[PDB]
Amino acid sequence: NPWLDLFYDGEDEPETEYGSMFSDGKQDEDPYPRDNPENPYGFLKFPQGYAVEMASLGSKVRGDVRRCCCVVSGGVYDNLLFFPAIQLIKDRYPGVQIDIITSARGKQTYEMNKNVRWATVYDLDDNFPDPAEYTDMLGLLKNRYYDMVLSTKLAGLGHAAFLFMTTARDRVSYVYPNVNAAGAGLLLSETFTPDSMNLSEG
Amino acid sequence: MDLPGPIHDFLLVFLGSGLILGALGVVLFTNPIFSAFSLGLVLVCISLFYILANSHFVASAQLLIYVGAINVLIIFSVMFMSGPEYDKKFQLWTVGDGVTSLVCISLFVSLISTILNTSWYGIIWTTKSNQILEQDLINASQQIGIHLSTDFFLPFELISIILLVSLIGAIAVARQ
Amino acid sequence: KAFHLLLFDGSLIFPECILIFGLILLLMIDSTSDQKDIPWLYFISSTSLVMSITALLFRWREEPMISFSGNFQTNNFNEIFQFLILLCSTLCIPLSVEYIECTEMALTEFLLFILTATLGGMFLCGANDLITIFVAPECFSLCSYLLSGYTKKDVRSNEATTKYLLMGGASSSILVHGFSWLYGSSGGEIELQEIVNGLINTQMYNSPGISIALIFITVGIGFKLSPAPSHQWTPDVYEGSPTPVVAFLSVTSKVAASASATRIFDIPFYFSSNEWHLLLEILAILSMILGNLIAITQTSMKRMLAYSSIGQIGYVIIGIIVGDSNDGYASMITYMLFYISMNLGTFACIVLFGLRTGTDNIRDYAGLYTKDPFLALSLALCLLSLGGLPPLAGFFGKIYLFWCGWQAGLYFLVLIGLLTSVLSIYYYLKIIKLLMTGRNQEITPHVRNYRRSPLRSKNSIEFSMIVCVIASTIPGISMNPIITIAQD
Amino acid sequence: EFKWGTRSFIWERFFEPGLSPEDAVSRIKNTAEGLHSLRHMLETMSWRYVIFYIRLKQAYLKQDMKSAMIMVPEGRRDDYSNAANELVDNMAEFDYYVRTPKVYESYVSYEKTLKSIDNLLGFLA
Amino acid sequence: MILEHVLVLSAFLFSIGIYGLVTSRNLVRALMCLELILNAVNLNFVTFSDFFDSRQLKGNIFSIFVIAIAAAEAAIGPAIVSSIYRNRKSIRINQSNLLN
Amino acid sequence: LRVEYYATTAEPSCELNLVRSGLGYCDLVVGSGVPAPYNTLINVHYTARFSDETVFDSSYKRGRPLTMRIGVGKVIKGLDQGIFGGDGVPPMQVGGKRKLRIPPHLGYGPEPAGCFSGDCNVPANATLLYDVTFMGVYSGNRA
Amino acid sequence: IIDGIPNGFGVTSFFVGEGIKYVGGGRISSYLFWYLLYVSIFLFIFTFT
Amino acid sequence: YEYDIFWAFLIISSVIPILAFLFSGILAPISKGPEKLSSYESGIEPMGDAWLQFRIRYYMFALVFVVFDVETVFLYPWAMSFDILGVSVFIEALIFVLILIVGLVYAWRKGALEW
Numbered sequence A: 001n002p003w004l005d006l007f008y009d010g011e012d013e014p015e016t017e018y019g020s021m022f023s024d025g026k027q028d029e030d031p032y033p034r035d036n037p038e039n040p041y042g043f044l045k046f047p048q049g050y051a052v053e054m055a056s057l058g059s060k061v062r063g064d065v066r067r068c069c070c071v072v073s074g075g076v077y078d079n080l081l082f083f084p085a086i087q088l089i090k091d092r093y094p095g096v097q098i099d100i101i102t103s104a105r106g107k108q109t110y111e112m113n114k115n116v117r118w119a120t121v122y123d124l125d126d127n128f129p130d131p132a133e134y135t136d137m138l139g140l141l142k143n144r145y146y147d148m149v150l151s152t153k154l155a156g157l158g159h160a161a162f163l164f165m166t167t168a169r170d171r172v173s174y175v176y177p178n179v180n181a182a183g184a185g186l187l188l189s190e191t192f193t194p195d196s197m198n199l200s201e202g
Numbered sequence B: 001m002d003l004p005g006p007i008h009d010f011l012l013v014f015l016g017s018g019l020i021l022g023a024l025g026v027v028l029f030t031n032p033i034f035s036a037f038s039l040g041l042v043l044v045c046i047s048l049f050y051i052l053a054n055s056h057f058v059a060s061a062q063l064l065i066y067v068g069a070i071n072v073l074i075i076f077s078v079m080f081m082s083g084p085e086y087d088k089k090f091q092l093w094t095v096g097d098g099v100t101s102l103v104c105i106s107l108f109v110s111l112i113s114t115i116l117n118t119s120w121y122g123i124i125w126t127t128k129s130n131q132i133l134e135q136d137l138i139n140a141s142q143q144i145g146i147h148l149s150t151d152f153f154l155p156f157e158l159i160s161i162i163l164l165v166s167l168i169g170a171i172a173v174a175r176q
Numbered sequence C: 001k002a003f004h005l006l007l008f009d010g011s012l013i014f015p016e017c018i019l020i021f022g023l024i025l026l027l028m029i030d031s032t033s034d035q036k037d038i039p040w041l042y043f044i045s046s047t048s049l050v051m052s053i054t055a056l057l058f059r060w061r062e063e064p065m066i067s068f069s070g071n072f073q074t075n076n077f078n079e080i081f082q083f084l085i086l087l088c089s090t091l092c093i094p095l096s097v098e099y100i101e102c103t104e105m106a107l108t109e110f111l112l113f114i115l116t117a118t119l120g121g122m123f124l125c126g127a128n129d130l131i132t133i134f135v136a137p138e139c140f141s142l143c144s145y146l147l148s149g150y151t152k153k154d155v156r157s158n159e160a161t162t163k164y165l166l167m168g169g170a171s172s173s174i175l176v177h178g179f180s181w182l183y184g185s186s187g188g189e190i191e192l193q194e195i196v197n198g199l200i201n202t203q204m205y206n207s208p209g210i211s212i213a214l215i216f217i218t219v220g221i222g223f224k225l226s227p228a229p230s231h232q233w234t235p236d237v238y239e240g241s242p243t244p245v246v247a248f249l250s251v252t253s254k255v256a257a258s259a260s261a262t263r264i265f266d267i268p269f270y271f272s273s274n275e276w277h278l279l280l281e282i283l284a285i286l287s288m289i290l291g292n293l294i295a296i297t298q299t300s301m302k303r304m305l306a307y308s309s310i311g312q313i314g315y316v317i318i319g320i321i322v323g324d325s326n327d328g329y330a331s332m333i334t335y336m337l338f339y340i341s342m343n344l345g346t347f348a349c350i351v352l353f354g355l356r357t358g359t360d361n362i363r364d365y366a367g368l369y370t371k372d373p374f375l376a377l378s379l380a381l382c383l384l385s386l387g388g389l390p391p392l393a394g395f396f397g398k399i400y401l402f403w404c405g406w407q408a409g410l411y412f413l414v415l416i417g418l419l420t421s422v423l424s425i426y427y428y429l430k431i432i433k434l435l436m437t438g439r440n441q442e443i444t445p446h447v448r449n450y451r452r453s454p455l456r457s458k459n460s461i462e463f464s465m466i467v468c469v470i471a472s473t474i475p476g477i478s479m480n481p482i483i484t485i486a487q488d
Numbered sequence D: 001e002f003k004w005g006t007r008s009f010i011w012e013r014f015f016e017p018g019l020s021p022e023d024a025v026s027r028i029k030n031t032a033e034g035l036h037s038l039r040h041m042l043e044t045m046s047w048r049y050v051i052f053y054i055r056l057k058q059a060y061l062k063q064d065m066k067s068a069m070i071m072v073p074e075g076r077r078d079d080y081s082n083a084a085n086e087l088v089d090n091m092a093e094f095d096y097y098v099r100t101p102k103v104y105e106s107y108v109s110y111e112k113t114l115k116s117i118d119n120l121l122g123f124l125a
Numbered sequence E: 001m002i003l004e005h006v007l008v009l010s011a012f013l014f015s016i017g018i019y020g021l022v023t024s025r026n027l028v029r030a031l032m033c034l035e036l037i038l039n040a041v042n043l044n045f046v047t048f049s050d051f052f053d054s055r056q057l058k059g060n061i062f063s064i065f066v067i068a069i070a071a072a073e074a075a076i077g078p079a080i081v082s083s084i085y086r087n088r089k090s091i092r093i094n095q096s097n098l099l100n
Numbered sequence F: 001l002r003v004e005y006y007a008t009t010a011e012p013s014c015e016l017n018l019v020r021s022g023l024g025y026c027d028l029v030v031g032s033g034v035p036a037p038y039n040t041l042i043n044v045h046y047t048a049r050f051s052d053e054t055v056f057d058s059s060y061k062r063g064r065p066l067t068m069r070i071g072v073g074k075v076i077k078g079l080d081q082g083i084f085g086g087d088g089v090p091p092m093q094v095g096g097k098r099k100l101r102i103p104p105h106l107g108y109g110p111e112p113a114g115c116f117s118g119d120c121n122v123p124a125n126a127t128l129l130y131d132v133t134f135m136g137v138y139s140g141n142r143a
Numbered sequence G: 001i002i003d004g005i006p007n008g009f010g011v012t013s014f015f016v017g018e019g020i021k022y023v024g025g026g027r028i029s030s031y032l033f034w035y036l037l038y039v040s041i042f043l044f045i046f047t048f049t
Numbered sequence H: 001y002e003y004d005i006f007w008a009f010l011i012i013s014s015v016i017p018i019l020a021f022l023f024s025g026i027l028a029p030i031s032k033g034p035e036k037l038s039s040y041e042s043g044i045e046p047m048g049d050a051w052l053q054f055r056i057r058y059y060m061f062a063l064v065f066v067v068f069d070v071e072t073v074f075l076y077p078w079a080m081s082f083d084i085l086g087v088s089v090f091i092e093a094l095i096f097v098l099i100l101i102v103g104l105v106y107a108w109r110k111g112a113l114e115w
């Protein structure tokens, strides 16, 4: 583990401030950049000193997410039980857009959900997918530019790589409790080990 | 125009040992104040080396400018750091330092296998005509003044522009 | 005395003396008068950067000469590069005056730093000595450290300045160590066309200490050009610096470093061509491979343009590698001239989009065609020219670069260049794919509240002098080379 | 081969076994030739080049004269030694007149050193 | 004489400075190690001017210019350090990895 | 000793006009151009051989003529006297081809040159032979 | 099988690009160490061997 | 020689404090105690160990001093060669002094030299 992150230098000092703007609060509280109707060229109103491009600062400093991808495995029951997690994402991150990847049966569950933007059908149970369909889904996920991706499917090396190629800042997944999930946590920002080989047993 | 031979070699060895001690103090001290004070020893030893070779003006310029630099460095290290922290005292060792120690040892070995294999005295006897000084220029600082004023005119004004712009940028960036 | 010998030699650097006079006049007026006016600063920066070209074009037909006692060489090769530096500064001043004014910061200091970096870039183009091959890029690198952290308040700019200062102190000291090794094992010679003779005079042209100097010089120069693993300074600095300064450092730094690399690998290092040829081949192959592969996995526009720049530099390196025989240096220019317009247009569109929008993420570029079709069209044209798409400048520039490579027998380099150019379409097409999304649900609120406003603005003129160039130079690629094969 | 002077001086000083007498006599001859060639640099008042040459040739001679005693027959080995000592003394004087430079005294010591080394070659044969 | 030993020391300094440039957890210390590297380069230049350039003194002039450049860097930072400490109240450079 | 093997055909022979300094020279081709100017950079082509006619250096090996500042002692004394002239030697003109016999005292002297890694490029007390060819005065632009 | 070759090319390109992007770290000390390791490698290649 | 006296004088000047320290060590008694070794704080017990952390605007003259030291170092060789050469070096160093004056004016007007 030292050999992975060389020059670690511990964690951040308690007195670090991370600047002034885009430092505290939530996503809906940011006062800058604001509209400048008096500008003849349509340029916004920016704070003194700060660079013009400020929307990228919240992701680095405050860890804001605007588009989230929840790849929920299972049918109607699991996708229904994932509703409090979706509401939690909406409450914690105001203004976020949540997209769901699930099976054909689980996609119909999100008809009665007020928080999901897109619900997409993808055969997650197939361990050997069609190369064209797999590539199309991966490119779609790459082109949505998800800030964070969560996976309730038990992720091996292949699912970890699929989440890795999503270009998401946070890659969070459930992993296999057995030895076959070795190296999956290297490609994921956060890993969860359930108490059994079946997550729906809970 | 030199010291006696054994005295010259003993001074070389002694100042080299002092320089090694100062550099090791620089790269092994947690406190920027302590490592800055070791840097001052390095500066003094290097100025003495310049005096040893033939450079009586470059040594004085090194002393003046680099002493100003280390004084400013100590001031800004006092001002931009936490408490005095005498307890820090030789920061800890990590793997990330151990790999770079090997890399730097390899680099130093590569340099010293060339220095120890090249006959530097052979080059001196080939550049005979480059060592025939003008008899009128007795003062070495006079030669350095003439060759700074005439041979290098464009860098002499470029460094003035560089210093002015560096002063302006230092004032503008560091202002509250 | 006479003050004449320097007076006649001082007229040779008159285009740089104009820049120095404009710099001093701007500084004196800033100090003297309390009030600040944007139009006067615009006027002084422009008239400093359009009188240097006026004087330089008047000096084009003059005889080549080495002035200031083996310190400044004026010939056909360096004049083109000095003109390129002046063109970059002229097309980057409108990019800077609006951007720094909208950040509510002092702008005379920014113009001073840009003018000094231009002055230190023009001197690097012809720098026929070893001291001024060190002092002049320190007139550029120090200003680049003062820039890219001029924001002074964003937490990104401080880290970018830290990385730039530390990595460029790591370089430009390895470079001077190589200069010391080259100066020592030569007989105390520092003029460019006088140390190969000095090497033979001391018979150290096959010494092991010459290989150290070549490697150190190549490393210190490949830091500034940023090919191959000397590239890591580029993206972070490109991601955490204001857009006009990073555009300047994208176009001005590569021109000066390319000129220095051409004048330091051909004039004083022609006897050991078989070594720096291999070094540059590795430096170019790694650059294209690892600058086009990482750019397709980028979520930020400035960082993607950084990987783009470190990919396109490898195409230009082929011009040094082939040599002056099979064109070569005539293919460095006529592509760097292209590259300047390509990058300055694709950065002007980014400048306007960020100023009117307030973002840098690529995902917020969706639906710009519906809001501003002109800006989307211009950015798409710049990016397609960047990808070497047929009717735009990059395609003819790349086939010119590859014709000389094939003519010199470098099949591997041309094949890697073509494969990386194929890889270099997916990006420069991803942004357009975003730009043509009519889905209102995928459109970010950043561009939903977008006001184009009924005024022209300066950057529009500056990139209308550019977008019409990257498309309409495609017939005029016979006028340019006859000015670039004329140099030798 | 060249047998000496082909690497850095400190490496040949400290990390080399040394020279056989048959190479030491050749180094004596080369030192004498270099001393003969040093006259032009002495006349141009280039004291740094001369002092470097004198120190290097001294460092060569302290080994070579000691290790070339074998080639001298027993009937002359004392007298040769005397000549060797004389040469050292002369070079010392030359040293003393290049550092703290003088023109007349350095020239006098230069001629004395040339005569002493010619006597040393006459003894070595 | 053993003048070449100076070269050895210069090389050592360079490597040591290079080492101190990498393991630096304080950017003031990184600036000091930059001064160390430039000092090693200057030692090489001065001893080479002593060796081969007793008349023109090009190495001494280059050493003066390198000292000037080093002082210009030492003026530009710690002003950059001043901006960083005013904005973040921390100096440790390895802890700032936002741009990655 | 450390001679790099370069295969080159020989030049026409001469009778050597020995001078007071010990240099020998002949005018194979008398140049019609400007004579070698003092304190100026000039490009010449040369083929430096040792005694016993073994070539150790050549500007044709590197592919371009060598540029040196002539007349101010930036080469060996024999080459300067052969090219720039003086002491009974007329200066060479542009396009002129001249043979040169540099004695050891006009060359590297009794000290070997280019010594590193167990060998030296030029031995001690070696007479050198140079087939120099004044290509021209240095100019920034080639045709 | 046949269609797996181009899609496999794209997937491997994506994976290698992501791996090279993520393997560094983004810290300045890592930048300097990687910048200096290849200098050491070049020096060992072109001088020692 | 004019510089062996310099080395001998430097050695003697460095030796003198060593002699003073040795003489004090062999002459003066030692009577150390825990109250004696405490840091002096005008009678009262010192609080936290020293440390002041000045403001930046106070210590911004040092960045001017770094540049001005280099400028005054560069001015010396010109003055040494002012008589051998003529008005050429006068014109050369006039720009140096003018740039120095302009930088001083900038530092004065921007408030860098204000306390």
Ligand SMILES: CCC[C@H]1CC[C@H]([C@H]2CC[C@@H](O[C@@H]3O[C@H](CO)[C@@H](O[C@H]4O[C@H](CO)[C@@H](O)[C@H](O)[C@H]4O)[C@H](O)[C@H]3O)CC2)CC1
Binding pocket: A004, A005, A006, A186, A187, E097, E100, G015, G016, G018, G019, G020, G022, G023, G024, G025, G026
């Ligand atoms: C076969 C394909 C090529 C290659 C295989 C191996 C692949 C990498 C993937 C991941 C990388 O990760 C390493 O682990 C570290 C965690 O500590 C990272 O450090 C982070 O630390 C923070 C989170 O802990 C983040 O904020 C930082 O951005 C990041 O530095 C470190 O980057 C990296 O060393 C190891 C193997 C790549 C594809």
